[PDB]
Structure 1
């Protein structure tokens, strides 16, 4: 019953475009239609980690070959201060056949003692050893920490704390102090010099709370619009040639259709946003843990549209709320059952799991079975495997990898 004319397909395709893509398409269509239109600083030089390293290199008594090797080494240093390439790549980049790996090793060791100490380290173990080598021998637990870092670091990252006792032949009193001394170091020596700027996004729709009720409105700073060029439209009448009149009429028709399509897209987006805000009202008042498990079919029934239209509209569009900026698809989620009769959204379950894990006993972290048992007191009835999946999504290590020395 729906006739797919090549322009209805163009109107439908306009729904799923973000603001930037829509602006680019509007510009592209604007440069082809004459009747469409749209309604000293220099800066400062900032010093980064590599600039500091090269400044220290230039003031170090290196030879020409050593200076070239140092330049190659400093080139392959990331923001965190770690060497991103093997020394074989540096040797190849030197391009001279008279230099062995030993000279590169010596130059790298000289560079690793620059400021900050531990920069240009091969890995975490090397950085920790470099940092520990600068401590005076009077440190109470220098030797135990050095042994643990040098020999047994994988089982320290596995939070064993029992096999470590057997291999190192220590006790809890000394092992805890050694672990604290290890944790007192700097995992990222290269972050002392920080450079950059956070990146922001421009929301498409703004929701506020006025006069006790939530108001949703399109963001006027980014809403796209076009306009009819009246100068060329005044020439639509006869201009001593029929072809000019036909051209003007066709271009005016296309421009008017495009303006209508843009207005319809904006209206549809506004209505969908209003429906979404009305459906999820507890979230904007009390944050997460109160999300409702709504789907596309829930929104598609309150606006008398189809599920495909709702799916297309909610793609890559952002909503700004007193809580933050969201993707307008973050409000759609799956659900689990409820003992009292109902549904619980997966976002609320993830928030509850995060809150429960964040307030557990460090000596005995909760397992997935314990989390399931705790959740089965509020009437959620979520499976252990689902809890494990949620925890993995939250990027939280398992129970045996969260215990401390207490």
Structure 2
């Protein structure tokens, strides 16, 4: 029960003229495909070219890359006289629309398409063209040495060519993006006072409906909805409070202090069917000083503890992250060494499990992290 000491006003008048607002209709928007089709219409194609262009633009993703191979498109046309070279010509024509480089098969194609539209006066263009055309994995893997051998070029020219490479656009289709992203309103709040975490539902999201009972059946049915809503929010609050009580240590000391709890614990604690617990916690979030977390985030698997008990997979992931974050660049830690290092604190996880956790956290293996 506090008052927000700062905020943003809403741009509108407090009172509206008494006439009723018109029914909501909507408003059209321009996505990438709409722009591409608009440019297609104003382009001197034939009829078959226009059909192939429609089929191609249909299969362009949000980033502007062509998701299907050309065989799918030529099959989708449904004609037999049309060959694959016509599809190639139409695709090459489409790839030069605005933004330049859209509908590209892969990154190499996009970069080459963008590079082909420069002027010859550019200081280092042929070097960049050759590097993209032939030796790309060398630039990605940060070799900088065998690339010097193959290119037969000194340091300065290669550095400038790489500077030109990192000046292009790898996602040309995201210039025309969505207007404004959505945001989620939290359902419950967990504050702390008296050394304890208080749990309370969002007041700004829970109004009390006016009871329409004066014309009095219908009154009893209306009260049934009230009782159902009461029971629903009571169940939500009880489940959230029990979950917060179980995971007290995490709320204080952050990660590496969760407990391996499953739906059975909640079902036995609140005396309810586990299906109801699964139903109520789906697509609902809680706001903590640490962030916003889905109500189902605290359930996970476990691993055996040598001294006794179990360790949350979230704690293992956090420990792996913190161990990797403080490794030596000269000799990055490997999976077996990581397992050996963690097998001193009672953590007993197989090498396969460590690999799965590392893949989940999206960290490159040791050989790609060496400096």
* TM, length-normalised to structure 1: 0.64
Confirm whether residue 222 of structure 1 aligns to residue 222 of structure 2.
Answer: no
CA contact (8 A) 1:39 1:225 kept: no
Q: Distance in 2 between matches of 1:76 and 1:312?
A: 36
SS in 1 for 2:287: strand
Distance change >3 Å, CA 156–CA 39, structure 1 → 2: closer
Stretch deviating more after TM superposition (290-299 or 383-392): 290-299
Shift of 1:276: 1.3
Alignment partner for residue 128 of structure 1, among 70, 88, 111? 111
Q: Distance in 2 between matches of 1:68 and 1:258?
A: 54
Shift of 1:272: 2.3
Shift of 1:132: 2.4
CA contact (8 A) 1:159 1:402 kept: no
Larger radius of gyration: 1
Shift of 1:161: 7.1
SS in 1 for 2:121: coil
Higher RCO structure, 1 or 2 (CA under 8 Å, sep 6+): 1
Alignment partner for residue 270 of structure 2, among 283, 298, 303? 303
Superimposed CA distance per residue, residues 45-76 of structure 1 (whole angstroms, 9 cap, x where no aligned partner): 54332343344445555566655554544444
CA contact (8 A) 1:319 1:327 kept: yes
Q: Distance in 2 between matches of 1:150 and 1:214?
A: 59
Stretch deviating more after TM superposition (137-146 or 113-122): 137-146
Superimposed CA distance per residue, residues 220-251 of structure 1 (whole angstroms, 9 cap, x where no aligned partner): 676799999968987xxxxxxxxxxxxxxxx9
Superimposed CA distance per residue, residues 257-310 of structure 1 (whole angstroms, 9 cap, x where no aligned partner): 887666445433322211211222233344323323334455456556676775
Shift of 1:390: 1.0
Q: Distance in 1 between matches of 2:210 and 2:110?
A: 62
Distance change >3 Å, CA 176–CA 214, structure 1 → 2: same
Tell me the residue number matched to 1:399.
366
How many residues are aligned here? 356
Superimposed CA distance per residue, residues 164-201 of structure 1 (whole angstroms, 9 cap, x where no aligned partner): 67766778887676555544432211111112543444
The correspondence of residues 272-287 of structure 1 with structure 2, limited to 5 A, is 272-287=239-254
Q: Return 5+ residue gaps in structure 2 as ranges.
A: 1-5, 10-19
Distance change >3 Å, CA 143–CA 340, structure 1 → 2: farther
Tell me the residue number matched to 2:194.
211
Tell me the residue number matched to 2:70.
87
Stretch deviating more after TM superposition (107-116 or 92-101): 92-101
Stretch deviating more after TM superposition (129-138 or 371-380): 371-380
Superimposed CA distance per residue, residues 138-177 of structure 1 (whole angstroms, 9 cap, x where no aligned partner): 6565444433432344676677778767766778887676
CA contact (8 A) 2:213 2:219 kept: no
Q: Distance in 1 between matches of 2:8 and 2:87?
A: 68
CA contact (8 A) 1:79 1:191 kept: yes
Shift of 1:401: 3.8
Q: Return 5+ residue gaps in structure 1 as ranges.
A: 7-36, 235-250
Distance change >3 Å, CA 75–CA 337, structure 1 → 2: closer
Distance change >3 Å, CA 175–CA 376, structure 1 → 2: farther
Shift of 1:321: 2.9
Shift of 1:382: 4.5
Q: Distance in 1 between matches of 2:323 and 2:252?
A: 22
Shift of 1:347: 1.0
* TM, length-normalised to structure 2: 0.69
- Aligned-residue Cα RMSD (Å) equals 7.5
Distance change >3 Å, CA 173–CA 322, structure 1 → 2: same
Shift of 1:219: 4.1
Q: Distance in 2 between matches of 1:104 and 1:261?
A: 60
